Amino acid sequence: EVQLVESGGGLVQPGGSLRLSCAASGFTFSSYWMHWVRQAPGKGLEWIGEIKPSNELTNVHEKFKDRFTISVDKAKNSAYLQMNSLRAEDTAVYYCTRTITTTEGYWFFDVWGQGTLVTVS
Amino acid sequence: SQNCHNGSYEISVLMMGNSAFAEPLKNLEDAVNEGLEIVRGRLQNAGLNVTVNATFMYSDGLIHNSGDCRSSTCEGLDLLRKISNAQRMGCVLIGPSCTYSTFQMYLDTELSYPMISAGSFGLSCDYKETLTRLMSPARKLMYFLVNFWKTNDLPFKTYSWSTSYVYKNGTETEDCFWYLNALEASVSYFSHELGFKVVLRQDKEFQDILMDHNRKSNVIIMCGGPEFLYKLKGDRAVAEDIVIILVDLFNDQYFEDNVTAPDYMKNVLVLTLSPGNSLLNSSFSRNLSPTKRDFALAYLNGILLFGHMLKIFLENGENITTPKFAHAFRNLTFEGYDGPVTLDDWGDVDSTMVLLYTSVDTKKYKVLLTYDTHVNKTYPVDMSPTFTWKNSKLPNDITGR
Amino acid sequence: DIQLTQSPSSLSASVGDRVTITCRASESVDYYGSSLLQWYQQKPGKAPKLLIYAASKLASGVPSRFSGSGSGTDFTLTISSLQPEDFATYYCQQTRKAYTFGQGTKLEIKTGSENLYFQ
Ligand SMILES: *[C@@H]1O[C@H](CO)[C@@H](O[C@@H]2O[C@H](CO)[C@@H](O[C@@H]3O[C@H](CO)[C@@H](O)[C@H](O)[C@H]3NC(C)=O)[C@H](O)[C@H]2NC(C)=O)[C@H](O)[C@H]1NC(C)=O
Fold first, then answer.
1. Which residue of A41, B268, B271, C42 is surrounded by the most CB atoms within 10 Å?
2. Do C101 and A45 count as a contact with CB atoms less than 8 A apart?
């Protein structure tokens, strides 16, 4: 079974840093692009960025590029989200997800992590 | 495997733009349509009740391929543009370029879609397994020049040449740019077979060498028309022992009876292709007139080559989706528009090349020698030419001190 | 970024009813005849789950009562014969330019004497 397990969430003071982990199970990690998506009340869902584990090519959205960093540990089959200079606006439920391409060439998020809450106060 | 089935044969025609040929794609479209009518006639006459239609995939994009991918989305988008193109693509792809189609040449498609290019002069296209070139590649021009340079057994050419100047300013036509690029490239057969070779990039550099008694070579190779040489040379005189090899492969003006030579094309040897065995006849040949007559002609012969291969494969009784069809566009002589068109083992158009000279007595262009690219052999035509040079013989490659 | 606006913000219906949720894009999400629009169902407590992809294609295992429609900038998710299990928070998602989601529509309701709201 394809699975994504998250950890590292909790309380952080403003200006502080936090590292999230996306442990993966039951698949070829290098092949699928790993993404980080946050969810805050009245903010719906928000895409942070992505990483191709095969060549470690990262693509973080312009809004988070300055303080958010996405990395992978190929040996541990895991993706990570390093968040720096955290503010009250970063208080959200963080998710790790993967994109799958169908036979017809359509790509989307299929499997998601259980989610981990990050609180900034 | 959708547009190449039982009595349904489709030809994918790429009509790009802002290349050498930005010329009304209507002309090119009219050439393709004329070719289709001959093919339909040929197949109906062979007793084959099949339909041949053409999908005109107009582009004029010159977009960057999958090599550059900013993100994952980029890749996914590339793959979706690919599948759409693959489903619409037919039996054969007739187009003007070479390698943007090569990341998608390895996509399944119809087992490396037989590609027929009416261009792709560059050395980068040499030896490609599914590529057919219906216009003389730079490789064939290079083979002629090396063979001609080594020749020292002719009564007019008594020296083996080893030195040359290659004029290239960067304002030439696409064909000329690639031909001069092949002579410029260090890895080329010409460069390997040349002990002294210097590329002249400025108009002043060329002009200064025409008079310099201390020059390292008497031979200058350039591409373009006689009007280009006149503007470049100007009122400046040319040293009595200088040979200018003007590469103008797609100009039939030299074979017209009313043509007198200018008085500057006297120390000039013109390398052109054998005149179209038939010229100035059809209504459409009368209105399409530059070297683009030959550009459009390849497009027409491309349809005829497909029609010839379609008949053959169906006669024997095989399929077209086979990778065989794809790798079966070489070592053949098919029936073109103006005559028989022969393709070598690599799928390139063999041609007869003609080296012309200005006769001092008549002031007319005369055939000095011919070069068959199929057998890679030179045949002398005029054994006693009337040159401007001493004793009516080609001077030595180095300055005779 | 391609902004996705959903309508309504929240809606209520009974078990067996036919419901419609609309998604409007700031710019066309189409590419070579395909509309790169997805429909995700986020059940309370759980993580987003794909229902519809490529504007109308049903994901593996998703019931036939869910259906997607539309092109360019306007899209519609239709849930016919609503079942109690189809009462979560629905979202639209586009893949044309990077990845963006709609604000979300909430299907909170009345079943019988059992009422399943959201707040
Ligand atoms: C006159 O005729 C020939 C073509 O009309 C020229 O051909 C040389 O032979 C081969 C092609 O016919 C090329 O060589 C290699 O052949 C192997 C065969 O299995 C291919 O895989 C290779 O890809 C191809 N070479 C490479 C390293 O890619 C030759 O390269 C081609 N010649 C040259 C110099 O390029 C003859 O050159 C030409 N004249 C004479 C007298 O040689």
1. B268
2. yes
Total residues found in chain B within this entry: 401
Superfamily designation of domain B4-113+278-338: Response regulator (3.40.50.2300)
Virtual torsion, Cα B245, B249, B250, B255, nearest 10 deg: 70
Atom of ligand 1 nearest to the CA of B373: 5
Q: How far apart are CA B40 and CA C62, in angstroms?
A: 51
Crossing angle between the packed helical segments B174-184 and B138-150, to the nearest 10 degrees = 50
Three-state DSSP state, C86: helix
Q: Which residues of B touch A106 (CB under 8 A)?
A: 80
Residue with tokens 């008694």: B213
The DSSP symbol for C14 reads -
Whether the CB of C31 is below 8 Å from some CB of chain B: the reply is yes
**Contact assignment for C57 to A109 by CB distance below 8 Å:** no
Nearest to B295 by CA among B335, B247, B333, B349: B349
Atom of ligand 1 nearest to the CA of B348: 5
Contact of B219 with B243, CB cutoff 8 Å: yes
Burial of B262 (0-12, 13-18, 19+ CB in 10 A): middle
Q: Which fold has domain C4-116?
A: Immunoglobulin-like (2.60.40)
- Using CA positions, which residue lies closest to atom 1 of ligand 1? B376
- Name, in order, each residue with C-beta under 8 angstroms of B271's C-beta and a sequence gap of 6 or more: B141, B144, B245, B246, B247, B248, B249, B353, B354, B355, B356
Where in chain B is CATH 3.40.50.2300? 4-113+278-338, 138-276+351-392
Q: Where are the domains of chain C?
A: 4-116
Cα distances (angstroms) measured from residue B168 to each of B102, B135, B163, B178:
29, 21, 17, 11
Integer Rg of chain C from CA:
14
Q: Which method was used?
A: X-ray
- Determine the structural domain holding residue A104 and report its residue range: 3-120
Nearest C-alpha neighbor of B398 from the set B219, B197, B192: B219
Give chain A's domain count. 1
Resolution for this model in angstroms, one decimal place? 3.5
- CATH of the structural domain B138-276+351-392, one choice from 3.50.30.20, 3.40.50.2300, 2.40.420.20, 3.40.640.10: 3.40.50.2300
> Which residues form ligand 1's pocket by a CB distance below 6 Å?
B 127, 143, 189, 344-346, 376
